[PDB]
Design an enzyme around this catalytic site. Structure first.
Site, PDB file in Angstrom:
ATOM      1  N   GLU A   1      -0.099  -7.540  10.176  1.00  0.00           N
ATOM      2  CA  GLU A   1      -0.361  -8.000   8.931  1.00  0.00           C
ATOM      3  C   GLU A   1      -1.674  -7.117   8.449  1.00  0.00           C
ATOM      4  O   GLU A   1      -2.516  -7.141   8.824  1.00  0.00           O
ATOM      5  CB  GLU A   1      -0.399  -9.290   8.418  1.00  0.00           C
ATOM      6  CG  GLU A   1      -0.512  -9.625   6.888  1.00  0.00           C
ATOM      7  CD  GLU A   1       0.656  -9.684   6.039  1.00  0.00           C
ATOM      8  OE1 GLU A   1       1.792  -9.294   6.710  1.00  0.00           O
ATOM      9  OE2 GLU A   1       0.733  -9.844   4.653  1.00  0.00           O
ATOM     10  N   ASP A   2      -1.648  -6.395   7.181  1.00  0.00           N
ATOM     11  CA  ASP A   2      -2.665  -5.869   6.531  1.00  0.00           C
ATOM     12  C   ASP A   2      -3.544  -4.930   7.427  1.00  0.00           C
ATOM     13  O   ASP A   2      -4.738  -4.916   7.472  1.00  0.00           O
ATOM     14  CB  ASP A   2      -3.619  -7.084   5.971  1.00  0.00           C
ATOM     15  CG  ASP A   2      -4.400  -6.755   4.774  1.00  0.00           C
ATOM     16  OD1 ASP A   2      -3.994  -5.886   3.929  1.00  0.00           O
ATOM     17  OD2 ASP A   2      -5.229  -7.421   4.575  1.00  0.00           O
TER      18      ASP A   2
ATOM     19  N   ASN B   1       0.602  -2.365  -6.921  1.00  0.00           N
ATOM     20  CA  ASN B   1      -0.038  -3.446  -6.971  1.00  0.00           C
ATOM     21  C   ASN B   1      -1.578  -3.077  -6.987  1.00  0.00           C
ATOM     22  O   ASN B   1      -1.963  -2.168  -6.174  1.00  0.00           O
ATOM     23  CB  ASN B   1       0.179  -4.515  -6.010  1.00  0.00           C
ATOM     24  CG  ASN B   1       1.330  -5.525  -6.260  1.00  0.00           C
ATOM     25  OD1 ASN B   1       1.592  -6.115  -7.171  1.00  0.00           O
ATOM     26  ND2 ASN B   1       2.320  -5.587  -5.261  1.00  0.00           N
TER      27      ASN B   1
ATOM     28  N   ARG C   1      -7.026  -3.704   6.174  1.00  0.00           N
ATOM     29  CA  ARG C   1      -6.413  -3.676   4.729  1.00  0.00           C
ATOM     30  C   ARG C   1      -5.411  -2.599   4.675  1.00  0.00           C
ATOM     31  O   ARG C   1      -5.692  -1.526   4.857  1.00  0.00           O
ATOM     32  CB  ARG C   1      -7.476  -3.783   3.678  1.00  0.00           C
ATOM     33  CG  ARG C   1      -8.610  -4.761   3.943  1.00  0.00           C
ATOM     34  CD  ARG C   1      -7.991  -6.110   4.078  1.00  0.00           C
ATOM     35  NE  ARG C   1      -7.233  -6.677   2.763  1.00  0.00           N
ATOM     36  CZ  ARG C   1      -7.782  -7.366   1.918  1.00  0.00           C
ATOM     37  NH1 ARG C   1      -9.080  -7.130   1.534  1.00  0.00           N
ATOM     38  NH2 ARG C   1      -6.989  -8.011   0.879  1.00  0.00           N
TER      39      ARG C   1
ATOM     40  N   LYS D   1      -0.759 -16.091   5.616  1.00  0.00           N
ATOM     41  CA  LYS D   1       0.704 -15.620   6.035  1.00  0.00           C
ATOM     42  C   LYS D   1       1.335 -16.437   6.704  1.00  0.00           C
ATOM     43  O   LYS D   1       2.525 -16.756   6.765  1.00  0.00           O
ATOM     44  CB  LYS D   1       0.537 -14.087   6.427  1.00  0.00           C
ATOM     45  CG  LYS D   1       1.938 -13.258   6.788  1.00  0.00           C
ATOM     46  CD  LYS D   1       2.406 -12.881   5.318  1.00  0.00           C
ATOM     47  CE  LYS D   1       3.365 -11.888   5.659  1.00  0.00           C
ATOM     48  NZ  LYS D   1       3.252 -10.901   4.423  1.00  0.00           N
TER      49      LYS D   1
ATOM     50  N   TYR E   1      -1.735 -16.795  -1.433  1.00  0.00           N
ATOM     51  CA  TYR E   1      -1.654 -15.498  -1.003  1.00  0.00           C
ATOM     52  C   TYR E   1      -2.218 -14.499  -1.898  1.00  0.00           C
ATOM     53  O   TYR E   1      -2.923 -14.794  -2.592  1.00  0.00           O
ATOM     54  CB  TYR E   1      -0.302 -15.367  -0.234  1.00  0.00           C
ATOM     55  CG  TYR E   1      -0.606 -14.423   0.954  1.00  0.00           C
ATOM     56  CD1 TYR E   1      -1.139 -14.741   2.314  1.00  0.00           C
ATOM     57  CD2 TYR E   1       0.174 -13.247   1.076  1.00  0.00           C
ATOM     58  CE1 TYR E   1      -1.302 -14.023   2.908  1.00  0.00           C
ATOM     59  CE2 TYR E   1       0.019 -12.362   1.984  1.00  0.00           C
ATOM     60  CZ  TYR E   1      -0.718 -12.614   3.108  1.00  0.00           C
ATOM     61  OH  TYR E   1      -1.002 -11.589   4.064  1.00  0.00           O
TER      62      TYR E   1
ATOM     63  N   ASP F   1       5.143  -6.554   8.420  1.00  0.00           N
ATOM     64  CA  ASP F   1       5.798  -6.889   7.143  1.00  0.00           C
ATOM     65  C   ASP F   1       5.557  -5.855   5.840  1.00  0.00           C
ATOM     66  O   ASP F   1       6.302  -5.790   5.089  1.00  0.00           O
ATOM     67  CB  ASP F   1       5.295  -8.421   6.572  1.00  0.00           C
ATOM     68  CG  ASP F   1       6.158  -8.724   5.510  1.00  0.00           C
ATOM     69  OD1 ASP F   1       7.288  -8.731   5.392  1.00  0.00           O
ATOM     70  OD2 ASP F   1       5.385  -9.087   4.377  1.00  0.00           O
ATOM     71  N   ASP F   2       4.354  -5.480   5.993  1.00  0.00           N
ATOM     72  CA  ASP F   2       3.987  -4.627   5.037  1.00  0.00           C
ATOM     73  C   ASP F   2       4.800  -3.101   4.825  1.00  0.00           C
ATOM     74  O   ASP F   2       5.195  -2.791   3.533  1.00  0.00           O
ATOM     75  CB  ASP F   2       2.260  -3.900   4.881  1.00  0.00           C
ATOM     76  CG  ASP F   2       1.153  -4.961   4.811  1.00  0.00           C
ATOM     77  OD1 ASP F   2       1.317  -5.824   4.047  1.00  0.00           O
ATOM     78  OD2 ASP F   2       0.579  -5.037   5.822  1.00  0.00           O
TER      79      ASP F   2
END
Lengths: 547, 547
Positions: free
Chosen positions: A231-232, A402, A142, A160, A89, A254-255
């Site tokens: 996701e993303d 990050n 993203r 994922k 990942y 989830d983010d």
């Protein structure tokens, strides 16, 4: 029989077929003669991975194992989880999508775009997936707004989905990776002869939601038992998607929701270790985006749930710093909606004009905690950490931005500057730091701690939707899994290697909360914690040879 | 229907499925939306290959394409054959076997060893291969005696089988790669926890032949239509295997018989370009192993066939050099059997004692040709090439020892030192050399020119055996394919890119020779060259989407 077994990734055991099995199944002489156990195959594969220098080649090897022996792939990931996570990942998977997207062609991707408008349900029906439990969908836009992947975002969904299988024992046949290709603003791709996605700039919001609405409605009819996880997705859509769908469909992001659950759990354990109790904390929140304010609100929600402090008093522990400085009601600007609830009411206009740089904000606020959600690099300087040591014997320092380059401080520097007193959670894994013969290591707040268990809990309970109560319950469950022993050793989370037990407990607590709210549609489940936990553990797919 | 089509490497077309096909086959939405032609897919894959730096990673990418789309794999190899050959076979394949043997696990290998003694036929029967045409077998011992691969030699068989498919259109379902694991003397492997083959030193000759005899008998019964090709066997066995089996089974050894056929064809075209006719050539054969003497004997055989010179006079054109010097009957040693027939009878004992170093041998013999079969490095020095220029206007210089490090002279040096006069064939591909604005490039004597056509001819004619006449016919056929145009441009072979036409012609001539000898078992074939050639071309599998 025969090579049909060896070429079926779900039933192939390779060299773990015994000599007697090979004779019975007509594969004697289709394998070299050594017979291995699963554990031996895992050790061999782990060495085949480490023979490769670069993460992308390690990834490519693991893809080949996933293609030929699904059980061995997941068994290898579970035996070496902390080391494998950065390969399978973030950040390797994004590099695989951006430059090696051919690695995903053979996987079970489902691809939607405006050319298939009105056919989404037919596409899903033709996939013939019975009892799908988890669907991961991205548009390749993203979350962190860098490297628009467009169609190549299918690899993010594929990676994922794999983490649900490894982390919570979602059966690999019951998970579906989806790309909603609404175009790409990646100018390289728009000119690339080998880009296979919709060759146009990203659709406007109206058409975007017409397609995503058709997706959600279609999935609710054809994959009715599934959790839909976003996701993303980029910030212009990810929060609005949750407001549009949270009540009507079984979905989460989830983010946004996973990150806040995970961070809140570790942060409450950090407060426990500090002895400086939640209402005595003075917390600098460095970074004031919607996501950062979401994390602070998730911390306050969790402390209110665990301790029954009044949430208004917990909100007064937060000092929010944006690009202009300390967020206050007397600063003279019109605040964004998400900044207003955390804005100081107790700081004068004269003080606000002198509260611009993080060093002067820290000198004035006298914080006991620095939460790094800034995405701007190493803002928690030596001078800033030494000031926090004036205000608490145990500074809580969370550099969560990050990648490691954008992070507010290295755990090594945090521990050195505080002579081992800092309590540290990180966004990435770091090696241990030794000071005076005493070893320190940050607790990584990996999202893996929460989304697999929410997926397994929602797959079992089949709730009508995933209200905020279920994510808060998951956050609490994770917090409470950290043992007195784990806490005595400075850990803020249960160990990542124990993810199956973690997920089974998170799922159990999520199911109990769905049962309390009467939103659970599965009436077969136990309704008491010990019996349910045992039931959930038995339901999990495990990467062992079964038959 | 559905993903079952996309996961069947023989019928999958990937992005070359049209939108209408995708709708009909229930794969709409299982691919990104771009539709490609085969030629477009080939161009895309070729760029995905060249994105990788190292040959082993290029190889690994090509393996993944072979696993997912067999037609696209072979189409890519045929479009870029000269560039791909060093990746899909020598030298990359040996490095893949030695250190990346996991790349072969998913392929259709068949594995024999002494544990399965008496079961070989049952193993073959259980593979259920109908109408097998080509079987490549190795024991991993290595012709060039370096890097004993043991069981990991299966990758050599797998790579060589692929070259029959690409070069002669053997259907990929009708070829079988075999490892006869009789142990390994590779001490690393004997200690390696991850080596999966027979963990013991190589069996003695008696037990070796008991197992290989059972293999040949079993294959003759279960795969009765197949050609058995021995690959990469060590010198202690490779010649004796051919003496044991050549008359009784349908078999050949490409390293011995293919190499000599290919070299002989190019060498005769070099003589044609030289104007120095075969009986006026004075040829130094640098290297006196069994293989080198085999090549000289194949040259003499081919010139006798093409020109009806007496073979005894052609033998007198050869000056054989071993490690002691010029091979003569008056030198005073007992010669090995293979050296005696080429030994000079016309050189005194006094001259023999002064004919030790290659430079003095070249000064005395006054050769017109240097054949480099020595395996000892760059022995054809500037001084030696300048001497050959005293004896002929067009020196023939064949540095055939592999790898490029062991080669007797670079083609660049040969052309520079002779100011463009040298006629050069190489064992490896080299870039062109430009001298005075005139471009020269060596002709590579790749074994691909001959074995595929012998396999396709023997698959069609089903001869009782493969006598030396069929290899000589193949050598002649290859020689005669070099066009007046090709020869005017200095080429010694037809172009490698035209391998399908080459193989169809070699096969046609092989079949006609089997028909003349009345050893052909297939009575359906035409018996005249034009009609047979057309028939053979129609029989070949081609890497195009057919249905």
């Amino acid at each position: 029989q025969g090579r049909a077994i060896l070429t079926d990734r779900y039933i192939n055991r390779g060299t773990a077929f015994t000599m007697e099995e090979r004779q019975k199944l007509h594969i004697l002489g289709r394998l070299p003669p050594v017979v291995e156990t699963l554990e031996e195959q895992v050790a061999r594969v782990y060495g085949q991975v480490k023979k490769y220098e670069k993460p992308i080649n390690r990834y490519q090897h693991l893809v080949s194992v996933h293609s030929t022996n699904t059980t061995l792939y997941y068994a290898t990931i579970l035996a070496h989880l902390e080391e494998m996570l950065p390969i399978i990942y973030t950040p390797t998977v994004g590099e695989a999508c951006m430059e090696y997207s051919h690695l995903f062609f053979r996987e079970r991707g489902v691809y939607f775009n405006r050319l298939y408008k009105g056919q989404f349900r037919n596409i899903m029906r033709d996939a013939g997936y019975q009892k799908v439990e988890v669907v991961v969908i991205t548009d390749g836009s993203r979350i962190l707004g860098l490297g628009d992947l467009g169609s190549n975002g299918i690899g993010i969904s594929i990676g994922k989905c794999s983490l649900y299988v490894a982390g919570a024992g979602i059966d690999p046949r019951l998970i579906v990776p989806v790309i909603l290709d609404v175009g790409t603003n990646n100018e390289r791709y728009l000119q690339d002869k080998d880009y296979l996605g919709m060759r146009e700039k990203r659709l406007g919001d109206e058409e975007f939601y017409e397609l995503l609405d058709e997706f959600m409605e279609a999935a609710s009819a054809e994959w009715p038992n599934a959790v839909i996880q976003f996701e993303d997705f980029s910030n212009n859509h990810c929060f609005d998607i949750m407001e549009r769908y949270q009540k009507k469909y079984r979905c989460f992001n989830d983010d946004i929701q996973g990150t806040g659950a995970v961070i809140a759990a570790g942060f409450l354990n950090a407060i426990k270790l500090s002895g400086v109790s939640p209402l005595q904390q003075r917390i600098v929140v460095f970074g004031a985006g919607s996501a950062a304010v979401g994390v602070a609100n998730n911390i306050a929600a969790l402390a209110a749930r665990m301790y029954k402090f009044p949430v208004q008093d917990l909100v007064k522990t937060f000092y929010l710093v944006d690009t202009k400085g300390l967020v206050t009601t007397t600063r003279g600007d019109q605040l964004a909606a998400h900044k207003k609830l955390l804005a100081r009411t107790d700081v004068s206009a004269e003080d606000s004009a002198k509260l611009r740089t993080l060093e002067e904000i820290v000198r004035f606020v006298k914080p006991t905690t620095l939460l790094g959600l800034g995405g701007v690099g190493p803002a928690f300087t030596e001078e800033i950490v030494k000031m926090v040591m004036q205000n608490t014997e145990r500074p809580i320092i969370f550099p969560l931005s990050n990648p490691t380059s954008k992070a507010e401080v290295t755990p090594e520097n945090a521990y050195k500057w505080t002579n081992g007193a800092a309590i540290v959670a990180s966004g990435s894994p770091f090696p241990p730091t030794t000071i005076g013969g005493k070893t320190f290591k940050p607790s990584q707040g990996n999202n893996l701690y929460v989304f697999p268990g929410v997926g397994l809990g929602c797959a079992l309970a089949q709730p009508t939707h995933i209200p905020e109560e279920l994510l808060l319950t998951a956050s609490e469950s994770l917090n409470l899994l950290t043992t007195e022993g784990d806490l005595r050793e400075g850990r803020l989370y249960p160990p990542l290697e124990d993810i199956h037990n973690i997920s089974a407990n998170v799922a159990t607590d999520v199911i109990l909360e769905a049962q309390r709210m009467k939103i659970d549609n599965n009436k077969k489940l136990p309704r008491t914690r010990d019996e349910l936990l045992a039931f959930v553990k038995k339901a999990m797919w495990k990467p062992v040879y079964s038959g």
